[PDB]
mmCIF file of C-alpha atoms and ligand atoms in Angstrom:
data_model
loop_
_atom_site.group_PDB
_atom_site.id
_atom_site.type_symbol
_atom_site.label_atom_id
_atom_site.label_comp_id
_atom_site.label_asym_id
_atom_site.label_seq_id
_atom_site.Cartn_x
_atom_site.Cartn_y
_atom_site.Cartn_z
ATOM 1 C CA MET A 92 0.075 0.002 0.290
ATOM 2 C CA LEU A 93 0.930 3.732 0.185
ATOM 3 C CA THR A 94 2.942 4.291 3.272
ATOM 4 C CA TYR A 95 2.447 8.065 3.046
ATOM 5 C CA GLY A 96 -1.150 8.164 1.728
ATOM 6 C CA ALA A 97 -3.118 9.370 -1.186
ATOM 7 C CA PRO A 98 -2.551 12.414 -2.860
ATOM 8 C CA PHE A 99 -4.721 15.375 -1.508
ATOM 9 C CA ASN A 100 -6.015 19.034 -1.922
ATOM 10 C CA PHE A 101 -3.215 21.263 -0.515
ATOM 11 C CA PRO A 102 -5.068 24.482 0.045
ATOM 12 C CA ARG A 103 -7.682 22.842 1.997
ATOM 13 C CA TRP A 104 -5.347 21.058 4.088
ATOM 14 C CA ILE A 105 -3.458 24.105 4.721
ATOM 15 C CA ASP A 106 -6.785 25.794 5.756
ATOM 16 C CA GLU A 107 -7.870 23.008 7.916
ATOM 17 C CA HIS A 108 -4.386 23.530 9.793
ATOM 18 C CA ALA A 109 -4.604 27.190 10.035
ATOM 19 C CA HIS A 110 -5.207 27.023 13.838
ATOM 20 C CA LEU A 111 -2.051 25.080 14.211
ATOM 21 C CA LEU A 112 -0.100 27.538 11.986
ATOM 22 C CA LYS A 113 0.773 30.302 14.667
ATOM 23 C CA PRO A 114 2.038 30.404 18.053
ATOM 24 C CA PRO A 115 2.610 28.593 20.216
ATOM 25 C CA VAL A 116 3.210 25.970 17.497
ATOM 26 C CA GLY A 117 3.590 27.883 14.359
ATOM 27 C CA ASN A 118 4.840 25.131 12.007
ATOM 28 C CA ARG A 119 3.057 21.797 11.119
ATOM 29 C CA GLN A 120 4.757 18.879 9.279
ATOM 30 C CA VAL A 121 2.534 17.198 6.525
ATOM 31 C CA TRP A 122 3.836 13.481 6.302
ATOM 32 C CA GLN A 123 5.334 11.441 9.397
ATOM 33 C CA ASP A 124 8.546 9.521 9.305
ATOM 34 C CA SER A 125 9.440 10.284 5.590
ATOM 35 C CA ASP A 126 12.763 10.872 4.584
ATOM 36 C CA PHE A 127 11.648 14.091 2.619
ATOM 37 C CA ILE A 128 10.518 16.193 6.029
ATOM 38 C CA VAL A 129 8.003 18.254 4.349
ATOM 39 C CA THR A 130 6.448 21.063 6.202
ATOM 40 C CA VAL A 131 4.188 24.273 6.370
ATOM 41 C CA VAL A 132 5.771 26.853 8.563
ATOM 42 C CA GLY A 133 3.351 29.924 9.796
ATOM 43 C CA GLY A 134 3.473 32.959 11.281
ATOM 44 C CA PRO A 135 4.004 35.034 13.103
ATOM 45 C CA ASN A 136 7.294 33.929 14.512
ATOM 46 C CA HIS A 137 10.550 35.564 14.823
ATOM 47 C CA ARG A 138 13.893 33.748 16.026
ATOM 48 C CA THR A 139 17.486 34.639 17.181
ATOM 49 C CA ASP A 140 19.344 31.631 15.837
ATOM 50 C CA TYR A 141 21.063 30.872 12.986
ATOM 51 C CA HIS A 142 20.816 27.331 11.318
ATOM 52 C CA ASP A 143 23.726 25.365 9.941
ATOM 53 C CA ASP A 144 22.268 22.568 8.069
ATOM 54 C CA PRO A 145 24.321 20.260 6.423
ATOM 55 C CA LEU A 146 21.735 19.476 3.691
ATOM 56 C CA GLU A 147 19.886 21.583 1.567
ATOM 57 C CA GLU A 148 16.627 23.124 2.530
ATOM 58 C CA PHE A 149 13.845 24.055 -0.163
ATOM 59 C CA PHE A 150 11.537 26.647 0.567
ATOM 60 C CA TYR A 151 8.455 28.044 -1.233
ATOM 61 C CA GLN A 152 6.315 30.752 0.215
ATOM 62 C CA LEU A 153 2.891 29.721 -0.619
ATOM 63 C CA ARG A 154 1.158 32.800 1.403
ATOM 64 C CA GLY A 155 2.148 36.198 2.478
ATOM 65 C CA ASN A 156 5.743 36.812 3.032
ATOM 66 C CA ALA A 157 9.139 36.424 5.068
ATOM 67 C CA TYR A 158 12.863 36.480 4.864
ATOM 68 C CA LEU A 159 16.087 34.968 5.689
ATOM 69 C CA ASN A 160 18.857 36.621 7.862
ATOM 70 C CA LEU A 161 21.723 34.926 6.483
ATOM 71 C CA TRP A 162 25.658 34.861 7.375
ATOM 72 C CA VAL A 163 27.268 35.399 4.167
ATOM 73 C CA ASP A 164 31.029 36.094 3.663
ATOM 74 C CA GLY A 165 31.297 37.234 7.298
ATOM 75 C CA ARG A 166 28.505 39.963 6.487
ATOM 76 C CA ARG A 167 24.957 39.916 7.839
ATOM 77 C CA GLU A 168 22.928 39.888 4.684
ATOM 78 C CA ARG A 169 19.067 39.143 4.031
ATOM 79 C CA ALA A 170 16.792 37.286 1.770
ATOM 80 C CA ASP A 171 13.168 37.897 0.939
ATOM 81 C CA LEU A 172 10.967 35.379 0.584
ATOM 82 C CA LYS A 173 8.110 37.374 -1.062
ATOM 83 C CA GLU A 174 4.907 35.592 -1.845
ATOM 84 C CA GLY A 175 5.126 33.404 -4.786
ATOM 85 C CA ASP A 176 9.129 32.994 -4.161
ATOM 86 C CA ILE A 177 10.884 29.617 -4.494
ATOM 87 C CA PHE A 178 14.585 28.844 -3.029
ATOM 88 C CA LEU A 179 17.018 26.576 -2.552
ATOM 89 C CA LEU A 180 19.529 27.022 0.558
ATOM 90 C CA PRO A 181 22.841 25.184 -0.131
ATOM 91 C CA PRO A 182 24.007 23.169 3.009
ATOM 92 C CA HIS A 183 25.788 24.652 6.081
ATOM 93 C CA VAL A 184 24.479 28.254 4.850
ATOM 94 C CA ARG A 185 23.597 29.940 8.163
ATOM 95 C CA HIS A 186 20.222 31.124 8.535
ATOM 96 C CA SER A 187 17.566 32.694 10.394
ATOM 97 C CA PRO A 188 13.975 32.384 9.416
ATOM 98 C CA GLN A 189 11.852 35.370 9.938
ATOM 99 C CA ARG A 190 7.782 35.079 9.517
ATOM 100 C CA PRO A 191 6.357 38.395 10.729
ATOM 101 C CA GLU A 192 2.896 37.583 8.973
ATOM 102 C CA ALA A 193 -0.053 36.289 10.398
ATOM 103 C CA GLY A 194 -1.494 33.666 7.943
ATOM 104 C CA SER A 195 1.424 33.461 5.980
ATOM 105 C CA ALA A 196 2.620 29.923 5.105
ATOM 106 C CA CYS A 197 5.786 28.438 3.383
ATOM 107 C CA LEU A 198 6.547 25.140 2.029
ATOM 108 C CA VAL A 199 9.672 23.906 3.682
ATOM 109 C CA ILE A 200 11.645 20.775 2.690
ATOM 110 C CA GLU A 201 14.602 18.927 4.090
ATOM 111 C CA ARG A 202 15.909 15.474 4.454
ATOM 112 C CA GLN A 203 16.238 13.364 7.604
ATOM 113 C CA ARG A 204 19.897 13.868 8.490
ATOM 114 C CA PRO A 205 21.625 10.376 8.822
ATOM 115 C CA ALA A 206 23.540 9.549 12.052
ATOM 116 C CA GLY A 207 26.794 11.385 12.218
ATOM 117 C CA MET A 208 25.485 14.510 10.318
ATOM 118 C CA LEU A 209 25.127 16.993 12.767
ATOM 119 C CA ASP A 210 23.159 20.276 13.015
ATOM 120 C CA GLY A 211 24.413 23.798 14.093
ATOM 121 C CA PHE A 212 22.535 26.343 15.908
ATOM 122 C CA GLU A 213 24.503 29.628 16.824
ATOM 123 C CA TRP A 214 23.705 33.067 17.819
ATOM 124 C CA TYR A 215 25.683 36.183 16.989
ATOM 125 C CA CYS A 216 26.685 39.494 18.885
ATOM 126 C CA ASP A 217 24.449 42.532 17.321
ATOM 127 C CA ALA A 218 27.795 44.499 18.547
ATOM 128 C CA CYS A 219 31.103 43.108 17.880
ATOM 129 C CA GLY A 220 29.593 40.870 14.988
ATOM 130 C CA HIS A 221 31.413 37.747 16.777
ATOM 131 C CA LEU A 222 29.886 34.465 17.311
ATOM 132 C CA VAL A 223 28.333 34.042 20.737
ATOM 133 C CA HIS A 224 26.975 30.624 21.173
ATOM 134 C CA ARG A 225 26.824 27.383 19.031
ATOM 135 C CA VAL A 226 25.434 23.806 19.750
ATOM 136 C CA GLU A 227 25.576 20.800 17.586
ATOM 137 C CA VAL A 228 23.005 18.468 17.749
ATOM 138 C CA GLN A 229 21.940 15.384 16.132
ATOM 139 C CA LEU A 230 18.646 16.218 14.720
ATOM 140 C CA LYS A 231 15.961 13.238 14.956
ATOM 141 C CA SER A 232 12.739 14.762 15.867
ATOM 142 C CA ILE A 233 12.459 18.179 15.172
ATOM 143 C CA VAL A 234 10.049 19.009 18.368
ATOM 144 C CA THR A 235 11.875 17.208 21.016
ATOM 145 C CA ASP A 236 15.256 17.839 19.601
ATOM 146 C CA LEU A 237 14.672 21.685 19.907
ATOM 147 C CA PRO A 238 12.393 23.450 22.727
ATOM 148 C CA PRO A 239 14.946 22.519 25.601
ATOM 149 C CA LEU A 240 17.990 23.403 23.229
ATOM 150 C CA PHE A 241 16.132 26.894 22.609
ATOM 151 C CA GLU A 242 15.358 27.458 26.396
ATOM 152 C CA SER A 243 18.664 26.996 27.954
ATOM 153 C CA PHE A 244 19.594 30.460 26.396
ATOM 154 C CA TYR A 245 16.664 32.817 26.952
HETATM 155 FE FE1 LIG B 425 17.187 25.619 9.042
#
């Protein structure tokens, strides 16, 4: 049979999950236990961490707008994700995804990292532009391997 089920209307499925696409949660993963981690991410949410992902991430901004703060060539650059945009982020490229809008929704796709492949999270000094903290973490379930990880800084 079909491990990950039938095809379904995306719009509807998004609408039926609007409640789940804003705080305290924000995001909602479409299929469970897939190599391809396919998620919709909502708003609003802002964050202070930069993600260094050892695999690429694919983004598609189905509704409203957002942006990525990026650490490029030792410089604090930014990438708009207006409504409509797609984008393929390289691995290890440092990114902080900012979703201001209530009712925005972005498709985000990623691979389960294999055992040995680590993610990094890091925060940066707004002043002296220097790396303040960095964790490396073996990601496996992106709701258990993250909320503590986040809270021992704030
Ligand atoms: Fe990320």
